[PDB]
Write a structure and sequence with these properties.
heterodimer, A: alpha+beta, 3 strands, 30% helix, B: mainly alpha, immune system, Complex, Inhibitor
Chain lengths: 73, 52
């Protein structure tokens, strides 16, 4: 069960199934960041930096790296 | 440390992260606060300190 932290969501602290990127460059699990924006916050959780967009963009290359790491272990 | 605030962290992940950012800011560490909080919540804070 040796899970690299780069693959963990800063809020869930678990492996990311649907990693998305916000305007600051930080990556989060979609359900987690969606709840954070639903709770009224307009801030990057990790950096407190205020966001310039609400667009969540899937981080496909990370989805690839996680999926590769999943099939090995 | 917040009677019902602490249980709401086993439930809500958003609140739990907010509180984890506060515990980190006051440099509470992994082992200094262990045995003052539940085992599940400790194993989580151990990961939050390591990467946040």
């Amino acid at each position: 069960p040796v899970i690299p932290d780069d693959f963990r969501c800063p809020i869930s602290l678990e492996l990311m199934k649907d990693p998305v990127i916000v305007s600051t460059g930080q990556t989060y699990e979609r359900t987690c960041i969606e709840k954070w924006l639903q709770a009224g916050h307009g801030t990057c959780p990790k950096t407190q930096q205020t966001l310039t967009s609400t667009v969540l963009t899937p981080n496909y290359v990370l989805r690839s790296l996680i999926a590769q790491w999943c099939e090995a272990n | 440390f917040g009677a019902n605030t602490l249980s709401n962290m086993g439930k809500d992940t958003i609140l739990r992260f907010q509180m984890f950012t506060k515990w980190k800011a006051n440099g509470y560490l992994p082992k200094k606060i262990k045995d003052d909080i539940p085992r599940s919540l400790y194993k989580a804070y151990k990961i939050h300190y390591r990467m946040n």
